[PDB]
């Protein structure tokens, strides 16, 4: 299959003590512009980091100067970390992410309900996050009284947004919820006859 | 911070001593891809489908955790043993979908500003401990604190209220979050 490569945490030369490390890959236009940033944190305090826009370990606090200067001195470490923009970021994007995260398309579940007056158009269980939700009343875009929630991250690679409309059901009206999403060849129109 | 389309957060390592407690995870656009169970030495994928589509050799996580343990020793000495500051956590409870009688649902308890990464999150339905619960790995925040989410599959009935119990060192006594 395809394999996930991590960054190589370069090594340094009641109470509790916490150390953290993380490698952050920032992609724009696919791989047309990658930016790679590794961060070394001691007790919520970032003290060393490698920023590929800089090209060198910089200390963030006084605790980072030994380790930044050290990791700069030895080329086996430095040039390897620099390469991890291609051996970690570019690798993971062009490989395992393309076969997983960047292939995931979950179509949304659009459901109009009436709470009590206020119509609630719930859009649930979709991926990725780009999505547009517009109300219509008898076929005219309503942008007044329309309040949507923020994008809610469920925690299982599916999002969910709720768009409430304020209205008053006159017999014969036709409200529609118009939902566009990249997992949808055509948009979704869910109607609600008054 | 930096602006981009996609953000892979690759190789998130945490180590904390005393106690020999670690965590090695991968994220993409905010969601966890997998973590490496350090005791079972195994890659637990968030989505099993992904685990069937790609792969990660958990030994890489194991070595990286070894390195981080080393760096933790050195930096522990170098700072004259400056210990860690405890952080008051903040819990909020809410349901996955809007509440509705007898409709199977998930009661989410989101706890933020966790540091150090040791929390005990207990569910208390009818003021009695409950557990089908699921809790997640620690997600790293921009301020290098942590947030952890505990869900709870439940059927809502009007009879029983709900509170999230949070146990942490930044808390003199535990803290309860009603619903």
């Amino acid at each position, epitope marked *: 299959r395809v*394999s996930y*490569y*991590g960054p*190589k945490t*370069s*090594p340094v030369q009641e109470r509790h003590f916490v150390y953290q490390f993380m490698g952050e890959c920032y992609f724009t236009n696919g791989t047309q512009r990658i930016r790679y940033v590794t961060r070394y944190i001691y007790n919520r305090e970032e003290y060393v980091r490698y920023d590929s826009d800089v090209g060198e370990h910089r200390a963030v606090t006084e605790l980072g100067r030994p380790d930044a200067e050290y990791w700069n001195s030895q080329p*086996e470490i430095l040039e*390897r970390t620099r390469a991890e923009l291609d*051996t*970690v970021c570019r*690798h993971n994007y062009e490989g395992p992410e393309t076969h997983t995260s960047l292939r995931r398309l979950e179509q949304p579940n659009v459901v109009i309900s009436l709470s009590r007056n206020t119509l609630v158009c719930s859009v649930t269980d979709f991926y990725p996050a780009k999505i547009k939700v517009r109300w219509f009343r008898n076929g005219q875009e309503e942008t007044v009284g329309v309040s949507s929630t923020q994008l809610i991250r469920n925690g299982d690679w599916t999002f969910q947004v709720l768009v409430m409309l304020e209205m008053t059901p006159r017999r014969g009206e036709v409200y529609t919820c118009h939902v566009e999403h990249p997992s949808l060849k055509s948009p979704i129109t869910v109607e609600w006859r008054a | 911070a930096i602006e981009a389309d996609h953000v892979g957060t690759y190789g998130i390592s945490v180590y904390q001593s005393p106690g*020999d407690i670690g965590q090695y995870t991968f994220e993409f656009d905010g969601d966890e891809l997998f973590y490496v169970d350090l005791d079972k*030495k195994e890659t637990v994928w968030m989505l099993p489908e992904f685990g069937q589509l790609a792969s990660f*050799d958990p*030994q*890489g*996580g*194991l*070595q*990286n955790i*070894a*390195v981080v*343990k*080393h760096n933790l020793g050195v930096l522990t000495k170098r700072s004259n043993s400056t210990p860690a500051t405890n952080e008051a956590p903040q819990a909020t409870v809410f349901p996955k979908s809007p509440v509705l009688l007898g409709q199977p649902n998930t009661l989410i308890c989101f706890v933020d500003n966790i540091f150090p990464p040791v929390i005990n999150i207990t569910w208390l339905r009818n003021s009695k401990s409950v557990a089908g619960v699921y809790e997640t790995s620690f997600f790293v925040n921009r301020d290098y604190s942590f947030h952890k989410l505990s869900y709870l599959t439940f059927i809502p009935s009007d009879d029983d209220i709900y509170d999230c119990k949070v146990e942490h060192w930044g808390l003199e006594e535990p803290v309860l979050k009603h619903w």
Partner: T-cell receptor
Amino acid sequence: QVRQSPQSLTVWEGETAILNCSYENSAFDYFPWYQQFPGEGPALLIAIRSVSDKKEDGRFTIFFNKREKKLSLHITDSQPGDSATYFCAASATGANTGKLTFGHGTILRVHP
Amino acid sequence: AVTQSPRNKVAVTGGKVTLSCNQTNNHNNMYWYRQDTGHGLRLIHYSYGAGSTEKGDIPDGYKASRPSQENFSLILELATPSQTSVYFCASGDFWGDTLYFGAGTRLSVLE
């Protein structure tokens, strides 16, 4: 796996020994050739990386073919002190494993 | 350097055989291989640092132990004649590209 041919080689003093290696997994990018003398542990002789096809170190030379996944260690003007076993290892370093998977080694005898 | 101990040993089937390895290179990765003709070098156990052990390709019959950064010990709790072989200890640095093998241990397990 890592497969080495031939299982043992015999060369005359002065000639060029050609020890061959081949790997299956294309994730491999680091290929260290270890050498072992009788009664001794093996020690890193000469190592190459997939980026460069050829590594030269005086008499020793690694030739690397990424396409055909094949390696060839050349020893030129071999002395009878080269009689020894040569293991060909490979590792996918990106996996951050620490495990090296060795070939079964070829046995070199150099006739004086 | 990396000195194993003992460098020769004879043990009856069913006895306990503790192969010790010491390493003075300030390395962290340590390995226990064995060598057999026709099977090359086969990794038995390895350890990333004090307190942890990892399972090699052939952990069956053997049990590692890393009480220190310097010391890495193979343990044969119930020796068998199939474990008669030449055992080799090694050590390397994190992400290292060189392995530093020991001298050797000829182990004879005999009925």
